[PDB]
Every structure is written in structure tokens, then in C-alpha cells.
């Protein structure tokens, strides 16, 4: 199924996993490079990153 | 080899306290003798405690008291259940015929007695504690007896580990005539000495390898290269700034802390001046 | 009679009681010497604690006997 | 191990027993004059190790025993500890019949071998029940102190010690009858309802020259934890607390002045010496490691 | 990142300052005649250790004198 914004559940899960894995190989990253790493350049890369925080997941 | 013996870091403390107490009581160093206890599991012998023993002297011969040993054996079984007599210990250097005579006499009590030797007056860095095993060989004629050397282990309980670590990290036992600076620097000296010995061994090995007198190992050499390409550990500017900050903070903590001592000496001097010089 | 009562800490007590006399007599001797309550006292001879019900008429005390006195201790 | 002394050192006279001095100090009885007399208890390494091992070996049950030693001046020296054949439940211990026979026989046998010390106190283990005097320990310690005056109650916690990695030994002495005299309330809470009846003591440990010599070669892999010690980082809270208490002591000494300055100076010197030792270790590490291949 | 994955090197990238920090790297191949080179470096380290030890001794001696 699509999680509202035309994104498959697998795509969202793998995006979150890619962000979590990249959090282990980067001291700090930029929004543009983070988007180039796992698609979705800046519209929801910052949103996903901030959602992972404030929940203990990152 | 032979029977695997497991030694705990409580027997050695018992022997050291025994030796220190009797040397202080008698003024001059003496020889102490006792009895070990532990467990026998298959081919494994474990020594976990020791109690003192009474010995008398007849001219040159040393005779172990038997009635006191029997009373102590009956007494200690109340507190410790799975504990049995295993061997006997003494403090001394090289093996002596007196030790062999004492072991032969003690053999009447247990089938396979051990022989724990402690060195309180050692003159080297070699291990002062050595576990010896006296098995009766089948040599005819004269009883040619040489106690076999045993490679003991350091099996230790968890609470035993905690207590041993606590006593090892102790520093307030001195701080008297000897400066605490000496005690603090001795540990650093020993650690640096051991690291230097290890790196000296590595240097000797690589020198031998480059000389050509030993087989050329392509893996150990590359491991040495990886080790040797990282001696300047973390020489970044941020580390230097942090180090200088720490040094300045400790310097301030020393200044505030010398000022109070100077003020206390001030107070004592003024108090003395206000009585021995003040005209009432 | 100069029967010795010794505490484990080193205190010494001298009492005078004939052997035929009851162990209650020893108890009240140490009572009027020190004051330790009767129910908080244990006495040992030859490594064996004596019972209150044994008169010291047939007893292995022939003079020179030292009695080890201890106080009952409990913990929680 | 060279370039020093190898004979009887300055840490061995603590193990020496003088019968005449002990007899004189027992006859003097300076404790009855000032009731806040004893404030320091010095325990040997062997006694502490035996106490901890016996307390832990008992499992979840409680165990109890005695401890030998002597008393000098304002300090109580505890040299050896021997267990007792007690059968106690998870809360209470009794020591009904075989304990006293064991006490007498063991003391006599030890005196036979050469043990010249007398009984100096008793200890009992709380299996995870903290370190405080219960309503029964207070009563029995008062009973012992009323007649056998040199005494001290040592409480050890095996379960908390093994879980936290630090020994929990507490030395206490009971006041007599009728002796009344954002901050945490643990000062009153961690003691029982008899908090005003007993007072704690300062516990310190000591070891002999041969003890330290043999324990120096106890294990040869703590050098890594010494080179990468990372001092001044694992005890920053300790130094801040010490600075706070030092400021309080300085304020008290200043109020008094307007002999208390001596202990404040001692505390300040101790804290500063610890900080300087840490800085010295850091400088040694920097010279050893980062000053190569520059 | 793909070099980090194969475990030849370990480290962290940083885009704020545009630099890569390496905590550990494998030991690459060495030629036969360069071994003396590394030997020299090791010797230097040993010397330094010795010096430090000597200094420590001097220090403690002085302290005792005081």
C-alpha cells in the first residue's frame, strides 16, 4: 500500500534504514547530500530525519 | 602437567600475612609451615584456603604436630563442608632436605600431598610462588626424590576478584615516610617498563627478520608495518587545545590549594607570634 | 575458691563457689560481679557448653578450671 | 624493585603486636571519658577479603562471625576475621549453640599457634539489605559494649557489593542509654529508626610490605588500563563534590576563627595532590606516545 | 563508504570541514629492502620509552630527598 504521499511501505522502510545506517558512517551531513544518497532530496529527507529523532531511533 | 592445580588469590595472602606476623613477633625472619585445603574433581586439584600448623623442633628435625592437626581438621569442617586436606606449604628459597623430610612425614596423612613454596625474600622478578608435586617414584635403592614443578593457574571467585582488585588498587596503606609521589610514579614506571619490554621484543624480532637468520613471514611483517605507521596517535589541533585546557585547569586547582596551605601556615605563625611575643 | 572467668576480649573475673554448688550459683556470682543478665550469658568449659541441669558434683573440674564467658549475639 | 629498601619497611610496624602497650591501654580505659572517642577503624586486607568471600559464599542467606585485633589511641585495628557455623534465614541469624563453642575453641587454637590478638568485634552480612544497624544488631552491640568495651559492629552487603563491583563495609558503634547528641534525607533514611542511637566510623584499609610485594605481581595485564588510564575523567564528580565539602569546611573554619583549619588544609592538599597526580599521568602519556615520529 | 564496508579501513567522513578521519587501516604490502626502515622507527620508539623511564626515576629520587 501507499503511505499517503505515493510512497510504498517498502520504500519508506528502506529509506529509514538507509538513514540509520548512514548515521553510523557520517559525523555530519548536508540535506542535499543526504537526499542524493537515498533519493527524496529535501522535501522529506529533513522530515524523515527529524521524525526518527524525538523517538529514540537516532 | 600431571594434576592440574588451581590456586586462588587467598592462599598467597594467608602465607604473606603469616610470614609478616611471625617475622614481626620474632624480630628476625623465620620459616612458617601450614596446610592447604580444597577440592578434588576427577584429575583436577583446587586449593582455595589454608590454615596455620604447629611444628616442633628436635635438634635438626622438624616434626609436624598431629593432634593439633586433627583438632583443626575436625574444627574447620563445620564452616567449610566440601573442603579436604590437599597439601602443605612453607616459605623458603631453593628446595632443602628439611622440606623433603617434612613432606615424607606429612605423607602419612593424605595419599598425594602437594607442596606449595612461597618466596618472601626473592631477589628477582621471577614468580615467587611455585607449586610442587611430590609423587613417589619407583626408583629403587635410595629414594631419589625431586618434586615435579607444576604450572599452577589463578582460578578465582567473583567476590575474590572484587576483593583482590580492591586491595591491589589500595594506596593509603603507606603515605607516611615515603612520599605519595613515589607510589604514584611507581605504577607508571612499571607499566612503561612492561610496554618497553614488549616493544623491544618486537624490535628484536623485526631486526632478526631483516637480518635473514629467521624465516621471512609476510604477514607478521605487514602487521608490524600497520602497527608502526600509527605511533603519532591523534596529533590534531583540537587535542592540543584540550590538553592545554586540562593543564591550565589543573594549574588553577593547584594554585587554589596552595593558597589555603599558605594561609594555614600564616594562621599558625600568627598564633605563635601572638602568644610568645605579644606582651600579654 | 578462685575460679577464673575469662571473656574473649581479655577481662578477668574471680569467683568463689564450691564444686557441689549449682551452676545457678556461678550465674549469680557473675551477676553480682558484673551484672550481665542471666538470659544473655553463655559459659564454656573444655570446649563444651554446660547445661543448667547438670550439678557439678560429677564434673571434670578439680581446681584450676577456667570458664570462657560469652554474650549471646544475634543479627538482622 | 631495586634502588629502595627491602628490610622491615615503614608499613610493617602496623602488624607488630606489643603486649605491654595493649595492657596499658586496656587498663587506662580512655573510652569512658569522651564517648565520641573511636572514629577510625583500620582493617587488614586479609580480614576484608575473608569477610567479603564468606558473605558472598552464603548466597541469599545471612551469615555472621567475629574479627580479631586491638585498639590504639583513637583507632581500632582489625587484623583477622574467622567465620562461625551459624544457620540463619534470609533475614535473621541466631548462633544458638555451636557458635560459642566454635568461638572459644578457635580462639584457644589460634593462641596455640601464635595468634596474639584478642577478639575485637563481630560482623553480620545483609544479603542485599543495605548497610545499617537493625533493631537487633543495635541491642546486641549495646550488650557487647556494656561489658566487653573494645568492640565494633561491622556490616557487609554481599549482593550489592557483587552487583555494583564495590565493597560495602560499615563500622558502627552504639551510644549508651540516654545519649541524645536540596540536602538529601538519606543521612536519616539509610539508617533504621534507631538512627540517633548509633554512629558510624571512618573505615580504612592497610596491608603489609610482603602483601604489597606479592600483590604487585598479581597480574600482568592491568598495564593497558594504566597507560590508557584516562584520569581526571572518571572521577570529575568526585573532585567537584570534594571541592564543595572543602568550601563548606573552609566556611566552618572561618566562622570558628572569628584547630579546625588543619583538617580543611588536609582535605585541600589531598584533592590538589590527586589532581596533580592525574595531570602528571597525562603528561607522561603525552611524552610517551604523541612525542614520537614528529 | 564502499571501502569502509570491505573493512580495509575504518573511519568517519565529515562534510562540514570536508575531511575523512581514519581510526584504523590495514597494513599494505612491503618490499624486502624497506624492512630496515620500519625497524628504525621502532628503535626510535624504544629509545623514547627509555628516556621517559629515566626521567621518572630522577623525579622520584628528588621527591624522596625533599
Q: What cell does B185 get?
A: 610514579
Question: Would an 8 Å CB–CB cutoff place E1 in contact with chain A?
Answer: yes
Sheet holding C48-49, edge to edge: C12-15, C3-7, C66-70, C42-45, C48-49
> How far is residue C12's CA from residue C4's CA, in Å, rounded to a whole number?
7
Task: Spell out which residues of chain B touch residue E56, defining contact as CB-CB under 8 Å.
Answer: 185, 188-189, 192
Instruction: Give whole-number Cα distances, A30 to A19, A23, A27, B212, in Å.
Output: 12, 12, 11, 54
Chains that touch C (3 or more CB pairs under 8 A): D
- In 3D, which of D66, B157, A6 has the Cα closest to residue C75? D66
Chain D residues whose CB is inside 8 A of the E37 CB are: none
Q: Which three cell numbers stand for residue D266?
A: 588536609
**Chain B residue with Cα closest to E25:** B226
Distance to chain D for B87, nearest Cα, Å: 19
**Cβ pair B11, B129 in contact under 8 A:** no
Taking only Cα atoms into account, the Rg of chain B, rounded to an integer number of angstroms, comes to 28
β pairing state of E9-14 and E19-25: antiparallel
Strands (E), chain D: 40-44, 64-72, 75-83, 118-125, 153-156, 169-174, 198-200, 202-206
D163 at interface of C, judged by CB pairs closer than 8 A = no
Contacts of E52 in chain D (CB under 8 A): 284, 287-288
Give the distance from residue E56's alpha carbon to the nearest chain D alpha carbon, in angstroms. 9
Q: What angle do CA D141, D143, D146 make, to 5 degrees?
A: 105
Closest CA relative to residue B226, chosen from E43, E4, E21, E9: E9
Let me know the angle formed at the C-alpha of D87 by D86 and D88, rounded to the nearest 5 degrees.
Answer: 110
DSSP state of B197: H
Chain D positions touching E48 (Cβ under 8 A) are 287-288, 291-292
Please, which residues have CB within 8 angstroms of residue D207's CB and are 6 or more apart in sequence?
Answer: B167, B170, B173, D11, D44, D45, D215
Nearest partner of D139 among C72, A9, B137, judged by Cα:
C72
Rounded to a whole number of angstroms, the distance from the CA of B20 to the nearest CA of chain D is 7
Give yes or no for a contact between B75 and D102, defined as CB atoms under 8 angstroms apart: yes
User: How far is the alpha carbon of E44 from chain A, nearest alpha carbon, in Å?
Assistant: 35
Determine, for residues A28 and E21 on separate chains, whether the beta-carbon distance falls below 8 Å: no
- B with A: touching (≥3 Cβ pairs within 8 Å): no
Distance between CA B91 and CA D208 in Å, rounded? 16
Do A and E make contact via 3 or more CB pairs under 8 A? The reply is yes
Q: What is the DSSP letter of D242?
A: H
Shortest CB distance from D212 goes to which of B71, B72, B173? B173
Q: In this structure, are residues E33 and E18 in contact, taking their beta carbons and an 8 Å threshold?
A: no
State the DSSP string of E1-65.
Answer: -HHHHTTSEEEEEETTTTEEEEEEE------GGGHHHHHHHHHHHHHHHHHHHHHHHHHHHHHHH
Residue E36 contacts A where some CB pair is shorter than 8 Å: no
Q: Which residues contact A19 (CB under 8 A, 6 or more apart)?
A: A34, A38, A48, A49, A52, A58
Cβ contacts of E15 on chain A, cutoff 8 Å: 26, 28-30, 33
Count of pairs with CB atoms under 8 A, one residue in C, one in D: 78
- Measuring CA to CA, how many Å separate D119 from each of C72, D19, D275, E63? 15, 15, 40, 41
Which architecture does CATH list for C2-70? Roll (3.10)
- The bridge status of strand B114-118 relative to strand B87-91 is parallel
Q: Using CA atoms of B167, B171, B177, B179 in order, give the dihedral in degrees to the nearest 10.
A: 150
How many angstroms separate the CA of residue C35 from the nearest CA in chain D?
Answer: 9
Cβ atoms of D123 and D64 within 8 Å: the answer is yes
Closest by CA position to B84, among listed B94, B93, B72, B73 = B73
Strand order in the sheet with B44-52: B4-7, B44-52, B34-41, B84-85
Chain D hits for C40, Cβ within 8 Å: 143
Dihedral (C-alpha) D281, D282, D288, D294: value to the nearest 10 degrees? -160
Window 120-179 of B, Cβ < 8 Å to E: 178-179
List chain B residues with CB under 8 Å of D56.
Answer: 157-159
Resolution stated for this PDB structure, in Å: 3.4
Which chain A positions have a beta carbon within 8 Å of E21's beta carbon?
27
Report the SS3 class of residue D75: strand
Neighbours of chain B (3+ CB pairs under 8 A): D, E
**Contact assignment for D11 to B194 by CB distance below 8 Å:** no
* B5 in Cβ contact with B149 (< 8 Å): no
B209 φ/ψ sector (left φ>0, alpha ψ -120 to 50, else beta): alpha
Q: How far apart are CA A38 and CA A40, in angstroms?
A: 7
Q: How was this structure determined?
A: cryo-EM
Which phi and psi (to 5°) does residue D79 adopt?
-100, -50
- Residue extents of the structural domains in chain C: 2-70
CB-CB contact of D149 with D31 (8 Å): yes
Q: Are E49 and B202 inside 8 Å of each other by CB? A: no
Angle at C72 between CA C69 and CA C73, to 5 degrees: 130
Residue of E2, E7, E10, E13 to mutate when probing chain A, most A C-beta within 10 A: E13
Give the burial class of B100: count Cβ atoms within 10 A of its Cβ; 0-12 exposed, 13-18 middle, 19 or more buried: middle
Burial, D202: exposed, middle or buried (Cβ in 10 Å; 0-12, 13-18, 19+)? exposed
Classify strands C48-49 and C42-45 as parallel, antiparallel or unpaired.
Answer: antiparallel
Amino acid at each position: 500500500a501507499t503511505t499517503a504521499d505515493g510512497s510504498s511501505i517498502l520504500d519508506r522502510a528502506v529509506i529509514e534504514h538507509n538513514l540509520l545506517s548512514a548515521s553510523k558512517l557520517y559525523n555530519n551531513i548536508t540535506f542535499e547530500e543526504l537526499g542524493a544518497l537515498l533519493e527524496i532530496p529535501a522535501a522529506k529527507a529533513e522530515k524523515i530525519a527529524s521524525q526518527m529523532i524525538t523517538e529514540g531511533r537516532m | 602437567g600431571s594434576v592440574s592445580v588451581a590456586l586462588h588469590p587467598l592462599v598467597i595472602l594467608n602465607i604473606s600475612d603469616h610470614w609478616i606476623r611471625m617475622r614481626s613477633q620474632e624480630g628476625r625472619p623465620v620459616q612458617v609451615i601450614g596446610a592447604l585445603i580444597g577440592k578434588q574433581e576427577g584429575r583436577n586439584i583446587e586449593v582455595m584456603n589454608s590454615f596455620e600448623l604447629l611444628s616442633h623442633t628436635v635438634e635438626e628435625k622438624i616434626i609436624i604436630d598431629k593432634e593439633y592437626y586433627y583438632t583443626k581438621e575436625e574444627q574447620f569442617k563445620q564452616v567449610f563442608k566440601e573442603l579436604e586436606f590437599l597439601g602443605w606449604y612453607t616459605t623458603g628459597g631453593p628446595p632443602d632436605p628439611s622440606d623433603i623430610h617434612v613432606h615424607k612425614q606429612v605423607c602419612e596423612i593424605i595419599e598425594s600431598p602437594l607442596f606449595l613454596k612461597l618466596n618472601p625474600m626473592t631477589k628477582h622478578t621471577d614468580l615467587p610462588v611455585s607449586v610442587f608435586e611430590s609423587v613417589i617414584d619407583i626408583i629403587n635403592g635410595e629414594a631419589t626424590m625431586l618434586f615435579a614443578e607444576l604450572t599452577y593457574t589463578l582460578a578465582t571467585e567473583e567476590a575474590e576478584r572484587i576483593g583482590v582488585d580492591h586491595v591491589a588498587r589500595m594506596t593509603a596503606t603507606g603515605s607516611g615516610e615515603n612520599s605519595t609521589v613515589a607510589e604514584h610514579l611507581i605504577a607508571q614506571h612499571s607499566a612503561i617498563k612492561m610496554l618497553h619490554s614488549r616493544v623491544k621484543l618486537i624490535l628484536e624480532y623485526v631486526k632478526a627478520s631483516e637480518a635473514g637468520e629467521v624465516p621471512f613471514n609476510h604477514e607478521i611483517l605487514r602487521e608490524a608495518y600497520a602497527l608502526c605507521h600509527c605511533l603519532p596517535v591523534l596529533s590534531t589541533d583540537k587535542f592540543k587545545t584540550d590538553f592545554y585546557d586540562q593543564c591550565n585547569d589543573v594549574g588553577l586547582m593547584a594554585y587554589l590549594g596552595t593558597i589555603t596551605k599558605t594561609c594555614n601556615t600564616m594562621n599558625q605563625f600568627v598564633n605563635k607570634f601572638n602568644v610568645l611575643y605579644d606582651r600579654q | 575458691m578462685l575460679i577464673k572467668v575469662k571473656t574473649l576480649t581479655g577481662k578477668e573475673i574471680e569467683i568463689d563457689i564450691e564444686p557441689t554448688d549449682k551452676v545457678e550459683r556461678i550465674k549469680e556470682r557473675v551477676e553480682e560481679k558484673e551484672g550481665i543478665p542471666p538470659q544473655q550469658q553463655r559459659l564454656i568449659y573444655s570446649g563444651k557448653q554446660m547445661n543448667d541441669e547438670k550439678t557439678a558434683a560429677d564434673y571434670k573440674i578439680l581446681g584450676g578450671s577456667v570458664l570462657h564467658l560469652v554474650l549471646a549475639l544475634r543479627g538482622g | 624493585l631495586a634502588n629502595n629498601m627491602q628490610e622491615a619497611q615503614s608499613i610493617d610496624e602496623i602488624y607488630k603486636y606489643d603486649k605491654k602497650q595493649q595492657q596499658e591501654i586496656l587498663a587506662a580505659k580512655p573510652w569512658t571519658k569522651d564517648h565520641h572517642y573511636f572514629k577510625y577503624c583500620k582493617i587488614s586486607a586479609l580480614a576484608l577479603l575473608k569477610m567479603v568471600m564468606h558473605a558472598r559464599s552464603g548466597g541469599n542467606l545471612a551469615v555472621m562471625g567475629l574479627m580479631l585485633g586491638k585498639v590504639d589511641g583513637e583507632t581500632m585495628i582489625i587484623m583477622d576475621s574467622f567465620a562461625l557455623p551459624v544457620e540463619g534465614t534470609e533475614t535473621r541469624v541466631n548462633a544458638q549453640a555451636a557458635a560459642y563453642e566454635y568461638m572459644a575453641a578457635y580462639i584457644e587454637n589460634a593462641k596455640q599457634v601464635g595468634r596474639l590478638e584478642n577478639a575485637i568485634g563481630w560482623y553480620h552480612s545483609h544479603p542485599g539489605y543495605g548497610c545499617w544497624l537493625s533493631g537487633i544488631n543495635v541491642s546486641t552491640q549495646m550488650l557487647n559494649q556494656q561489658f566487653q568495651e573494645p568492640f565494633v559492629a561491622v556490616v557487609i552487603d554481599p549482593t550489592r557489593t557483587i552487583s555494583a563491583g564495590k565493597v560495602n563495609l560499615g563500622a558502627f558503634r552504639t551510644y549508651p542509654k540516654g545519649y541524645k547528641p536540596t540536602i538529601p534525607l538519606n543521612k536519616i533514611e539509610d539508617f533504621g529508626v534507631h538512627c540517633k542511637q548509633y554512629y558510624a566510623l571512618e573505615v580504612s584499609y592497610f596491608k603489609s610490605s610482603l602483601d604489597r610485594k606479592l600483590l604487585e605481581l598479581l597480574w600482568n595485564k592491568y598495564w593497558v588500563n594504566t597507560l590508557s588510564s584516562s584520569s581526571l575523567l572518571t572521577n570529575a564528580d568526585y573532585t567537584t563534590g570534594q571541592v564543595f565539602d572543602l568550601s563548606e569546611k573552609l566556611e566552618q573554619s572561618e566562622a570558628q576563627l572569628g584547630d579546625k583549619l588543619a583538617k580543611a588544609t588536609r582535605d585541600s592538599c589531598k584533592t590538589t595532590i590527586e589532581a596533580i597526580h592525574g595531570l602528571m599521568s597525562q603528561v607522561i602519556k603525552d611524552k610517551l606516545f604523541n612525542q614520537i615520529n614528529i | 563508504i564502499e571501502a569502509v564496508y570491505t573493512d580495509i579501513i575504518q573511519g568517519k567522513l565529515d562534510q562540514r570541514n570536508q575531511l575523512l578521519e581514519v581510526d584504523f587501516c590495514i597494513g599494505r604490502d612491503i618490499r624486502k629492502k624497506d624492512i630496515n626502515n620500519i625497524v628504525k622507527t621502532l628503535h626510535e620508539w624504544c629509545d623514547g620509552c627509555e628516556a621517559v623511564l629515566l626521567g621518572i626515576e630522577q623525579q622520584v629520587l628528588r621527591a624522596n630527598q625533599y
